[PDB]
């Protein structure tokens, strides 16, 4: 009789699986973002579709409708804050035109590459999932972390590890210690 802890699934998988063209467009997006599996492409097209459908039934409401007012403007304000909808495209009509590369662009992986710090999307992830890209004080190792517009400027190497701070790795710190008996006693 425990309280019924809820949940949901984050993705929607495509109807027609074998389409010869769509397969390619996804493969590119996997490379020109640096994604693990095709599920990380699905996760976003599902997010976008619910985002779109939200705006879809929102523009059906004749204007100056509080639902088209309060809700429609509570979307944009969230949609710009992450850097997806550009600083001002802001409209219910410009979210419907908003495509899949826009969210993917704002991922912590696709940022950590963007400004310095990485010089690869594969170096980016490997950097993220291993400890240190940390945003601010807190380490965030999620390659999907979704950098917000103004959280951008706070992202640099972390207070720990050879890249941002105290001590180098114990790969090298083991290398300096094996010449300790070689070049020492």
């Amino acid at each position: 009789p425990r309280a019924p802890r809820t949940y949901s699934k984050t993705y929607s998988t495509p109807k027609r699986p074998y389409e010869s063209s769509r397969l390619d467009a996804e493969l590119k997006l996997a490379g020109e973002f640096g994604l693990k599996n095709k599920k990380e492409i699905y996760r976003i097209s599902f997010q976008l579709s619910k985002i779109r459908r939200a705006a879809r039934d929102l523009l059906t409401r004749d204007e100056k409708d509080p639902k088209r007012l309060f809700e429609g403007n509570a979307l944009i304000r969230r949609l710009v804050r992450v850097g997806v909808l550009s600083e001002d495209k802001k409209k219910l009509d410009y979210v419907l035109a908003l495509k899949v590369e826009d969210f993917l662009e704002r991922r912590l992986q696709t940022q950590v590459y963007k400004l310095g710090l990485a010089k690869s999307v594969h170096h980016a992830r490997v950097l993220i999932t291993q400890r240190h890209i940390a945003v601010g004080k807190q380490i965030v190792n999620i390659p999907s972390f979704m950098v917000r517009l103004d959280s951008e400027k706070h992202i640099d190497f972390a207070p720990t590890s050879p890249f941002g701070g105290a001590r180098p790795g114990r790969v090298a710190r083991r290398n300096a210690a094996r010449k300790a008996e070689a070049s020492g006693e």
């Binding site: 390619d24 493969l27 590119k28 996997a30 490379g31 640096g34 994604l35 693990k36 599996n37 594969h122 992830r125």
Partner: protein, 62 residues
């Protein structure tokens, strides 16, 4: 249909084919790193053309 035939030969073709060992080969990358190799070989590389973009030909014609 007619329900009593020969059971004599079963596992015939399978057991009269010669065993062939699978070659020791480089381990392929897993995860995103496999999806990296697929990006290149399909484009950024352009192994094959004539508009087929042939993925796995018999070692062409000539």
């Amino acid at each position: 249909a007619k329900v009593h035939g020969s059971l004599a030969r079963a596992g015939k073709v399978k057991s009269q084919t010669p065993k062939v060992e699978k070659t020791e080969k480089p381990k392929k990358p897993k995860g995103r790193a496999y999806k990296r190799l697929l990006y290149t070989r399909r484009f950024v590389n352009v192994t094959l053309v004539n508009g087929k973009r042939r993925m796995n030909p018999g070692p062409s014609v000539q």
